[PDB]
Amino acid sequence: DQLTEEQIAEFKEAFSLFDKDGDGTITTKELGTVMRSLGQNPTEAELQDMINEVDADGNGTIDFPEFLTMMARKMKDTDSEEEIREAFRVFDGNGYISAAELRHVMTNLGEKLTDEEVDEMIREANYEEFVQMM
Amino acid sequence: KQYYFARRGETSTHDTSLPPPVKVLSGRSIPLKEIPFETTRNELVQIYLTSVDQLIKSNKLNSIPSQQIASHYLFLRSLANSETDGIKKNQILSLAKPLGIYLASKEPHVWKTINELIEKSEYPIIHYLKNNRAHSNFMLALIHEYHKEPLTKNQSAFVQKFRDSSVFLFPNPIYTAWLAHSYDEDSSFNPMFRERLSTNFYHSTLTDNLLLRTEPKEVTLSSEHHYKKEKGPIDSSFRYQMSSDRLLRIQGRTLLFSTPQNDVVAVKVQKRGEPKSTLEEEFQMADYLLKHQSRLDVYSKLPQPLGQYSVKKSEILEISRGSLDFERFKTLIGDSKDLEVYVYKAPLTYFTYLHDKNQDLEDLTASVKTNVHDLFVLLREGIMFPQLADIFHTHFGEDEREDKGRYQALVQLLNVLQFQLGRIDKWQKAVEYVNLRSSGLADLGDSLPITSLFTSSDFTKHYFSALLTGGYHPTFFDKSSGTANSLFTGKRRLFGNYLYLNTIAEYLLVIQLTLGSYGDKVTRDMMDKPKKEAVWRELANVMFTSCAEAIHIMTGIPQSRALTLLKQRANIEKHFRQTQFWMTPDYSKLDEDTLQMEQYSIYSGEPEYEFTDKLVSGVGLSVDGTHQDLGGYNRESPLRELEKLLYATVTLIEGTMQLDKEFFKQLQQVEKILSGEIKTDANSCFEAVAQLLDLARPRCHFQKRLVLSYYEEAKLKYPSAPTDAYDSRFQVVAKTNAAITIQRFWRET
Amino acid sequence: GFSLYTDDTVKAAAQYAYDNYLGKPYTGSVESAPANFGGRMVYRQHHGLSHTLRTMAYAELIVEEARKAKLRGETLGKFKDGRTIADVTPQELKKIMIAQAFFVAGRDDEASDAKNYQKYHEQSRDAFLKYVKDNESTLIPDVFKDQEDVNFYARVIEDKSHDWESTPAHVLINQGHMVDLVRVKQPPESFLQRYFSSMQRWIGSQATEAVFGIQRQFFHATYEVVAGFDSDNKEPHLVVSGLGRYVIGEDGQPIREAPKKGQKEGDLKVFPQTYKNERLMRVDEFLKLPEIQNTFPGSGKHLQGGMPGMNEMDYWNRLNSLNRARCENDVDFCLKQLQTAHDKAKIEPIKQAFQSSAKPPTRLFRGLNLSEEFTKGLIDQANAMIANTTERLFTDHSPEAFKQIKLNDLSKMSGRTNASTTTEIKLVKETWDSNVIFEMLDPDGLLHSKQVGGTESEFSVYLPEDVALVPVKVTLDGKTQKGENRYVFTFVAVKSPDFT
Ligand SMILES: [Ca+2]
Ligand SMILES: [Mg+2]
């Protein structure tokens, strides 16, 4: 599996940000935007699928439990070797760049790590090799 | 399932059906006039542009400190990036060009710093002023130096109220972005200008300048809301067999009765002076919150109401006879041969107050979390509680004061010429019977709909007459037109926003006084100074976490991040020290020298608390001589980090909301370009997307991921466009996005 | 203007020098034992945080007394051009204070060895340059004009030569460090006189007395042992210039050279060597020779050397108290102590210049919109009356201060009616925004004021004719909304029975 807590905090901040009147329900007009803001930019038909499935009465509004269930059912087979390859390729370029730049960026970009965590991951490692050795 | 029955929106004004804006003095009816904010601000910005032109054509440019020329240049670049008209934008850039030339010549290191701020942001002045450079009003200095033609009276008033910083003249998106980034980790901004004589504090002017830029709020309650939907009356199909063989105690006017199921049946008898409407209102609210508890996701244990009816005063006074305070009770209840009683079934912890000293700090933390969560969840639902506790200021002229003696947590916003938070009169008797309990909230009867803050209700007309009637002072009186002009009268259009923020601040103030009462009652039995300091330190942690939970519930900002933003602005160490010092009588034993020497420590980098009244021994500061006050008579409250924490909380909530408004106002402008509805050059589209990048919440990444996706689509529309100016910031965004999607992969396993 | 106490820049430099150099244990095995005051460790007890902060305050006070001495028409020194310490600007003084924060940052012990001396001074220069290289952002634009500027200050820190008497920055940074080490050297009558004659060359007698009086009050403020001057001590006089002695030749008369045009000139300096008579000269006889009595006030005048009050019983445990270590380990605390001391040293010369002396408020502000020519003619009189009350150290000054105060009829605009004042400076600025603010101080309730009931914080004051208002300090606090200078005068109420 289920979604973590640092994902739930981000989902809740996004859902709260795109709920413009603050009644805990987002319209379908900004469901596409709140899903693009989360790195899930789907086709018009892919969004229409959930427009029909989620809204089975025509209410046109999603509650945060419904949004969480939808976003977890979407994230079943979306992250893969392609995602990891793009993630590693943005840093690199033949397949190995550096272990120093990695340790630098994993503590200054995003939800920063710690020395023990980074080193352990560095010890667990060759970008593609480390990405396919886990 | 889970959603709120209230929804926010914008209205035209709140200035409908208000007391007419007149001041009656000696038979003269002085009219009160508003000074328009966003028009005087623009007039002063245009006077600033004229002054910059005069500075350039006067060749005195070398006689300006090179950090003020850097400030002028970065402001001109930000201001030209905020303009949408080509002519004004190009005039501003023609003004900023000679300054850039002079800086590239004279100060090449300052120029190398500027050029790196500029390739990072569209408003590079907000990142230049995240430090003590904000306390220098370069715009107003330049206006005073070269615009020798006199300012009008409205511009003079704007200068007077916002004399401290130069950010009080930025347009709305730049000011909102600067205010939100002031709370960033890499910021050293503190709204305190310690000069040689005065040490001006202006943490309130930040929220004052933020609120005068907002649009009047309006909350619309749904049709099935408690204060809209009507339910049938209450039928006395249930009577409770009151038996003194089970009476536990008499709490106020409530008779508690034991239960074989370990619950407690409370019988709340009608007080002297209240009608049956109040008791049936509490019955209805309890039934409502029981019906809609899983929807609102309320944490409290709620009092399950059983009935509401009338009983013979004989039965009440015969059940109540076998007790201790039986006489006191007999004076509270009403005088009638039949009394209205409301009977509910609550758990035992419902009747233990929150400041009760028989609960360990773990249980106190859990209970304060429950109470804060439910208070703000019900504020999101449209229900406010104006009487959590009877906090008062200056009981002396209570009935004849504009505030009716009631304590205003944001007194500087809701009044003219009021600069600090005032004394709390008997701060402990004020929370003695607070409505916060070990189980959650209590006394849900004296609630109110949130819409009573945005309208001229009886609550609003009673306690906030100064705000609703406009401000007067002999110095506002324009002796020519015979009307008192003020920036404060404009708040008549917006008085609901001020009252919303004041409700949040007073919730937090009640939480703080409850925690302080707990600490003062639990450390009196201890002489081990380390343990007393540990108690007060954990209470400061509880207070800061409660304010962070308020921010999280209102705005959506994660609680950890809101806590970090708070701790940037208010010092938790000085808060723990000042609460321990002033919320205990131990400072009454110290003489003058030790008192001053300990204030040197608890204030730590700012002036001390000066009071000229005599300390009653064993008590502390007191005007009556038996109960302790928080502050001297006619002076401010000595809890300064509490005031800063309250203003940081309300400024964070309101500034986050306003920045989300600016962000979506710019995002729809961006999307009108990537669909052909506005055909412009590539520079216009890239400037739009980059401004959209400059309006995202500090340290919020999904907003930057959204802006990055828009930038990719903009590149897909203008293929051969030169992006040498914007590739850097979006490269950083792509890098941090890759870092995030890596961390989440490894951290999972 | 600029003040050491409220700057957050010199305070940041001092916090850096403490967390990196002045709060680190000594490693030189020479007086490197860290003391333990109360329960707190103090590593550098002779050249620590307290010492550097007192040296900064000495620089500030020296330039203030120089400015004050220029007003009453003194003849000061010359720094190779028409200039003196009276002409140091606040930016130059801020640079000097940033330099003084590291002057003893690179030490490892209290060794006076020349090689150790130069090593420590160049390490201090390196620490200063490293701090500037670290925080170059807010140092070169405003504080330090050029990089040659930082190099000049780092070269005056390293002190390769001994050209202390070259430029105002040299004189300040070196006197402030040498005049502080006057409570530790054992013979006070010689070190005090040497520093007195070395500083009065630049400023003057009446101002050096003030510098040393406020120095003793700083010592009291920061819990330091205060020496006691005594012009009848029999300890052998040591010449602080170098380290030598004075021997009298065979009857009672000191051995003196035979230079040109005069057989009565510079005393002959003798290193410690044999005697026999060839006996040394004590500080008593040294302080009463004709060439030193007519230039040093302390000749024939004594000091108690301690608190006026508390005896040695609790004096020792107040010096060895816990707040001394806190003053040695908190920049905020030591700065607050020095600030209080300087404020009281600014006020008390007035109280001692006169004879002995709901709740009433202490500080009352009263705005006024006056002319510009009149404001200049007012600031002139106020500064001319402020620059006649120096904190005398040896000689109690005169009733001349009283007569000048009574002859200066500036106090007529400050009272003679029922003035409408307030206890908020923001209220004076955000209602009338006057250009001439009078701040009247009521230290002990001598100002009969009553609240009038934001007109709740407002008061009405009536000045009794037996109480006078004397100016403490003129100021300048920006510009009013009408675009004009705003001068914040400051007065103090004193019971003056002689003003009938
Ligand atoms: Ca909605
Ligand atoms: Mg009052």
Side-chain angles (χ1 to χ4, degrees), chain B residues 392-405:
Chain B
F392 273 88
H393 176 67
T394 181
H395 262 293
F396 174 73
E398 175 191 359
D399 292 59
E400 308 301 328
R401 285 174 59 92
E402 287 172 309
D403 37 314
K404 299 297 181 293

PDB file of all heavy atoms in Angstrom, chain B residues 392-405:
ATOM      1  N   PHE B 392     -10.360  37.498  29.577  1.00  0.00           N
ATOM      2  CA  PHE B 392     -10.724  38.895  29.706  1.00  0.00           C
ATOM      3  C   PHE B 392      -9.487  39.769  29.749  1.00  0.00           C
ATOM      4  O   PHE B 392      -8.402  39.332  30.134  1.00  0.00           O
ATOM      5  CB  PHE B 392     -11.558  39.151  30.962  1.00  0.00           C
ATOM      6  CG  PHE B 392     -13.023  38.952  30.762  1.00  0.00           C
ATOM      7  CD1 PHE B 392     -13.595  37.709  30.926  1.00  0.00           C
ATOM      8  CD2 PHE B 392     -13.829  40.010  30.411  1.00  0.00           C
ATOM      9  CE1 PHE B 392     -14.938  37.526  30.738  1.00  0.00           C
ATOM     10  CE2 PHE B 392     -15.172  39.832  30.224  1.00  0.00           C
ATOM     11  CZ  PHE B 392     -15.728  38.588  30.387  1.00  0.00           C
ATOM     12  N   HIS B 393      -9.675  41.011  29.337  1.00  0.00           N
ATOM     13  CA  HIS B 393      -8.701  42.077  29.490  1.00  0.00           C
ATOM     14  C   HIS B 393      -9.403  43.210  30.222  1.00  0.00           C
ATOM     15  O   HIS B 393     -10.542  43.548  29.885  1.00  0.00           O
ATOM     16  CB  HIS B 393      -8.182  42.524  28.118  1.00  0.00           C
ATOM     17  CG  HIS B 393      -7.244  43.688  28.164  1.00  0.00           C
ATOM     18  ND1 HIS B 393      -5.992  43.612  28.726  1.00  0.00           N
ATOM     19  CD2 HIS B 393      -7.371  44.951  27.698  1.00  0.00           C
ATOM     20  CE1 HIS B 393      -5.391  44.783  28.618  1.00  0.00           C
ATOM     21  NE2 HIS B 393      -6.207  45.614  27.998  1.00  0.00           N
ATOM     22  N   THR B 394      -8.749  43.755  31.251  1.00  0.00           N
ATOM     23  CA  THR B 394      -9.204  44.933  31.994  1.00  0.00           C
ATOM     24  C   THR B 394     -10.693  44.909  32.347  1.00  0.00           C
ATOM     25  O   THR B 394     -11.485  45.680  31.797  1.00  0.00           O
ATOM     26  CB  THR B 394      -8.832  46.244  31.275  1.00  0.00           C
ATOM     27  OG1 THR B 394      -9.281  47.360  32.053  1.00  0.00           O
ATOM     28  CG2 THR B 394      -9.408  46.362  29.877  1.00  0.00           C
ATOM     29  N   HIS B 395     -11.081  44.028  33.269  1.00  0.00           N
ATOM     30  CA  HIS B 395     -12.436  43.990  33.816  1.00  0.00           C
ATOM     31  C   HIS B 395     -12.931  45.355  34.290  1.00  0.00           C
ATOM     32  O   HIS B 395     -14.128  45.526  34.540  1.00  0.00           O
ATOM     33  CB  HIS B 395     -12.495  43.024  35.000  1.00  0.00           C
ATOM     34  CG  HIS B 395     -13.013  41.663  34.662  1.00  0.00           C
ATOM     35  ND1 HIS B 395     -14.314  41.438  34.269  1.00  0.00           N
ATOM     36  CD2 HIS B 395     -12.414  40.450  34.691  1.00  0.00           C
ATOM     37  CE1 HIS B 395     -14.488  40.147  34.055  1.00  0.00           C
ATOM     38  NE2 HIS B 395     -13.352  39.524  34.304  1.00  0.00           N
ATOM     39  N   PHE B 396     -12.017  46.321  34.426  1.00  0.00           N
ATOM     40  CA  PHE B 396     -12.320  47.596  35.074  1.00  0.00           C
ATOM     41  C   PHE B 396     -13.481  48.317  34.397  1.00  0.00           C
ATOM     42  O   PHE B 396     -14.522  48.565  35.016  1.00  0.00           O
ATOM     43  CB  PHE B 396     -11.065  48.468  35.078  1.00  0.00           C
ATOM     44  CG  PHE B 396     -11.288  49.864  35.580  1.00  0.00           C
ATOM     45  CD1 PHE B 396     -11.492  50.108  36.927  1.00  0.00           C
ATOM     46  CD2 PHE B 396     -11.282  50.937  34.704  1.00  0.00           C
ATOM     47  CE1 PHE B 396     -11.692  51.398  37.390  1.00  0.00           C
ATOM     48  CE2 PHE B 396     -11.480  52.228  35.161  1.00  0.00           C
ATOM     49  CZ  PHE B 396     -11.686  52.459  36.505  1.00  0.00           C
ATOM     50  N   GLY B 397     -13.317  48.678  33.128  1.00  0.00           N
ATOM     51  CA  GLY B 397     -14.380  49.343  32.399  1.00  0.00           C
ATOM     52  C   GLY B 397     -15.075  48.410  31.431  1.00  0.00           C
ATOM     53  O   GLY B 397     -15.389  48.797  30.302  1.00  0.00           O
ATOM     54  N   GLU B 398     -15.330  47.178  31.881  1.00  0.00           N
ATOM     55  CA  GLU B 398     -15.736  46.100  30.984  1.00  0.00           C
ATOM     56  C   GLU B 398     -16.929  46.486  30.120  1.00  0.00           C
ATOM     57  O   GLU B 398     -16.895  46.339  28.895  1.00  0.00           O
ATOM     58  CB  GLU B 398     -16.053  44.845  31.795  1.00  0.00           C
ATOM     59  CG  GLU B 398     -16.593  43.697  30.964  1.00  0.00           C
ATOM     60  CD  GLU B 398     -17.147  42.571  31.812  1.00  0.00           C
ATOM     61  OE1 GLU B 398     -17.100  42.681  33.055  1.00  0.00           O
ATOM     62  OE2 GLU B 398     -17.635  41.576  31.235  1.00  0.00           O
ATOM     63  N   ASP B 399     -17.997  46.987  30.740  1.00  0.00           N
ATOM     64  CA  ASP B 399     -19.235  47.200  30.000  1.00  0.00           C
ATOM     65  C   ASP B 399     -19.132  48.355  29.011  1.00  0.00           C
ATOM     66  O   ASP B 399     -19.844  48.365  28.003  1.00  0.00           O
ATOM     67  CB  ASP B 399     -20.391  47.444  30.969  1.00  0.00           C
ATOM     68  CG  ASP B 399     -20.741  46.213  31.776  1.00  0.00           C
ATOM     69  OD1 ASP B 399     -19.856  45.698  32.489  1.00  0.00           O
ATOM     70  OD2 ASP B 399     -21.904  45.767  31.700  1.00  0.00           O
ATOM     71  N   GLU B 400     -18.265  49.331  29.273  1.00  0.00           N
ATOM     72  CA  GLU B 400     -18.207  50.539  28.461  1.00  0.00           C
ATOM     73  C   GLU B 400     -17.057  50.552  27.464  1.00  0.00           C
ATOM     74  O   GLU B 400     -16.870  51.557  26.773  1.00  0.00           O
ATOM     75  CB  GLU B 400     -18.118  51.772  29.364  1.00  0.00           C
ATOM     76  CG  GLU B 400     -19.201  51.828  30.430  1.00  0.00           C
ATOM     77  CD  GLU B 400     -20.605  51.842  29.851  1.00  0.00           C
ATOM     78  OE1 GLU B 400     -20.794  52.387  28.743  1.00  0.00           O
ATOM     79  OE2 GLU B 400     -21.523  51.305  30.505  1.00  0.00           O
ATOM     80  N   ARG B 401     -16.284  49.475  27.372  1.00  0.00           N
ATOM     81  CA  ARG B 401     -15.209  49.380  26.395  1.00  0.00           C
ATOM     82  C   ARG B 401     -15.736  48.813  25.086  1.00  0.00           C
ATOM     83  O   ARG B 401     -16.643  47.976  25.080  1.00  0.00           O
ATOM     84  CB  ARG B 401     -14.074  48.503  26.921  1.00  0.00           C
ATOM     85  CG  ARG B 401     -13.219  49.160  27.978  1.00  0.00           C
ATOM     86  CD  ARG B 401     -12.217  48.175  28.541  1.00  0.00           C
ATOM     87  NE  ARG B 401     -11.339  47.635  27.508  1.00  0.00           N
ATOM     88  CZ  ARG B 401     -10.165  48.160  27.179  1.00  0.00           C
ATOM     89  NH1 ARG B 401      -9.722  49.242  27.802  1.00  0.00           N
ATOM     90  NH2 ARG B 401      -9.432  47.601  26.230  1.00  0.00           N
ATOM     91  N   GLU B 402     -15.154  49.272  23.974  1.00  0.00           N
ATOM     92  CA  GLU B 402     -15.580  48.818  22.655  1.00  0.00           C
ATOM     93  C   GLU B 402     -15.483  47.309  22.496  1.00  0.00           C
ATOM     94  O   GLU B 402     -16.289  46.724  21.766  1.00  0.00           O
ATOM     95  CB  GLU B 402     -14.748  49.498  21.569  1.00  0.00           C
ATOM     96  CG  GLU B 402     -15.079  50.962  21.344  1.00  0.00           C
ATOM     97  CD  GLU B 402     -14.098  51.643  20.406  1.00  0.00           C
ATOM     98  OE1 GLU B 402     -12.877  51.530  20.636  1.00  0.00           O
ATOM     99  OE2 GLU B 402     -14.546  52.286  19.436  1.00  0.00           O
ATOM    100  N   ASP B 403     -14.527  46.667  23.159  1.00  0.00           N
ATOM    101  CA  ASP B 403     -14.385  45.219  23.110  1.00  0.00           C
ATOM    102  C   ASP B 403     -15.142  44.510  24.220  1.00  0.00           C
ATOM    103  O   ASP B 403     -15.078  43.281  24.301  1.00  0.00           O
ATOM    104  CB  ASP B 403     -12.908  44.834  23.177  1.00  0.00           C
ATOM    105  CG  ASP B 403     -12.119  45.724  24.106  1.00  0.00           C
ATOM    106  OD1 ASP B 403     -12.287  46.956  24.023  1.00  0.00           O
ATOM    107  OD2 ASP B 403     -11.333  45.196  24.918  1.00  0.00           O
ATOM    108  N   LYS B 404     -15.846  45.253  25.076  1.00  0.00           N
ATOM    109  CA  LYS B 404     -16.610  44.684  26.186  1.00  0.00           C
ATOM    110  C   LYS B 404     -15.723  43.882  27.133  1.00  0.00           C
ATOM    111  O   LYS B 404     -16.179  42.932  27.772  1.00  0.00           O
ATOM    112  CB  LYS B 404     -17.770  43.822  25.682  1.00  0.00           C
ATOM    113  CG  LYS B 404     -18.781  44.573  24.836  1.00  0.00           C
ATOM    114  CD  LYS B 404     -19.468  45.663  25.632  1.00  0.00           C
ATOM    115  CE  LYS B 404     -20.504  46.392  24.794  1.00  0.00           C
ATOM    116  NZ  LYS B 404     -19.890  47.174  23.689  1.00  0.00           N
ATOM    117  N   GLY B 405     -14.448  44.256  27.231  1.00  0.00           N
ATOM    118  CA  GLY B 405     -13.503  43.568  28.079  1.00  0.00           C
ATOM    119  C   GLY B 405     -12.982  42.254  27.543  1.00  0.00           C
ATOM    120  O   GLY B 405     -11.955  41.774  28.028  1.00  0.00           O
TER     121      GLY B 405
END
